[PDB]
Design a binder for this molecule. Sequence first.
Ligand SMILES: CCCCCCCC/C=C\CCCCCCCC(=O)OC[C@H](O)CO
Ligand SMILES: CCCCCCCC/C=C\CCCCCCCC(=O)OC[C@H](O)CO
Ligand SMILES: CCCCCCCC/C=C\CCCCCCCC(=O)OC[C@H](O)CO
Ligand SMILES: CCCCCCCC/C=C\CCCCCCCC(=O)OC[C@H](O)CO
Ligand SMILES: CCCCCCCCCCCCCCC
Ligand SMILES: CCCCCCCCCCCCCCC
Ligand SMILES: CCCCCCCCCCCCCCC
Ligand SMILES: [Ca+2]
Ligand code: NA
Ligand code: NA
Ligand code: NA
Length: 297
Amino acid sequence: MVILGVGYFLLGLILLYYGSDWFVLGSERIARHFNVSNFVIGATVMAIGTSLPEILTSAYASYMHAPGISIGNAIGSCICNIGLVLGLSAIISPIIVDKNLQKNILVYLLFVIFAAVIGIDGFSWIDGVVLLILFIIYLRWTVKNGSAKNNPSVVFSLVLLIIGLIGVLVGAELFVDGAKKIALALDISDKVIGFTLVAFGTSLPELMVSLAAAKRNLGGMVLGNVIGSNIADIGGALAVGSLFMHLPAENVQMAVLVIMSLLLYLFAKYSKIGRWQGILFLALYIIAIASLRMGGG
Ligand SMILES: CCCCCCCC/C=C\CCCCCCCC(=O)OC[C@H](O)CO
Ligand SMILES: CCCCCCCC/C=C\CCCCCCCC(=O)OC[C@H](O)CO
Ligand SMILES: CCCCCCCC/C=C\CCCCCCCC(=O)OC[C@H](O)CO
Ligand SMILES: CCCCCCCC/C=C\CCCCCCCC(=O)OC[C@H](O)CO
Ligand SMILES: CCCCCCCCCCCCCCC
Ligand SMILES: CCCCCCCCCCCCCCC
Ligand SMILES: CCCCCCCCCCCCCCC
Ligand SMILES: [Ca+2]
Ligand code: NA
Ligand code: NA
Ligand code: NA
């Protein structure tokens, strides 16, 4: 039991580690095949693939009548994605953002502010429908602006991508299940801590994929994955949650998200996303996890 837990834990780590690199390599190749930028592949295929845990989690939680957990997971993931994931990644591989990606980040910022505003009284199913529609528009706009028989180069590419994605998603689940089994076996299970960590657990794919990308100096891919995952987490995970049940407002967390998103845009536009920007993101992240209410909703 503690043995099974340790087994899952370690296997999950392995699958996350190697799976993330395969996913990145396959995504980079697919981007070159389709003549789209690494940012675009990161913001679309990679972002959505890695946010599937958040979407399922938020949908399931709201369906099980725990809408606090549903929104806690969605918004907590956005804060994790900028504070921790981008924070670490930016230090590893500093990013200078080109003029068109800047505009994409501005649209991201507007989307986040819009979500925060309509969410002041919580999120209804109509809020969800609107956010989903905007999510869809964002994707098509993003692909438009970043765009332009059986080929073994392409087949290898898609195999790498899909196997890598399977690797990071199964790996994250094993890692989390393994940790939970260890905690249970050692009699240190704590539901409040466990629910606090839900957003982190679902963000393990983004974490490892972004770090793999950053190691290969693929900064546009990192930024696309972070921006796209947050939009997927709001227009997808949060949105679907709100379809099952009204989601209670999380105004403090949304304000933290809006602040981090604003900083991300300002750095992108007027500076760079490099070492000291990443240090700031991590510092704000650490302050957030030190001070936000526990329990993940
Ligand atoms: C992704 C492309 C753009 C991204 C970001 C741009 C900002 C969008 C905000 C204005 C349009 C909003 C849609 C139409 C107006 C809906 C207003 C609203 O409040 O919808 C929810 C409603 O409150 C439920 O009762
Ligand atoms: C398309 C690009 C050009 C247009 C860019 C527009 C950007 C607007 C985004 C932030 C402003 C806030 C939006 C105002 C929406 C508030 C609606 C509202 O108050 O809805 C209450 C309802 O109860 C909620 O569920
Ligand atoms: C502290 C070191 C962190 C290690 C990284 C692992 C992150 C995932 C752990 C649980 C997330 C989802 C749990 C959802 C259900 C909670 C059930 C529970 O009570 O688990 C509590 C226990 O303390 C949990 O270790
Ligand atoms: C060989 C393998 C190399 C792997 C290298 C990965 C580097 C890990 C970076 C931060 C880990 C965080 C440690 C504990 C995570 C808990 C954070 C938390 O509190 O999450 C709250 C919320 O759920 C979400 O913001
Ligand atoms: C023109 C290329 C992009 C087309 C649009 C792709 C839409 C994919 C939608 C995925 C949404 C996942 C969450 C559903 C709730
Ligand atoms: C730029 C506007 C973003 C809004 C950020 C969300 C938090 C809303 C602050 C409201 C504080 C008062 C709440 C009383 C119900
Ligand atoms: C490639 C060299 C990287 C070295 C940069 C040091 C990283 C500092 C991270 C500090 C995190 C700050 C949180 C609050 C103390
Ligand atoms: Ca609302
Ligand atoms: Na994602
Ligand atoms: Na995720
Ligand atoms: Na997450």
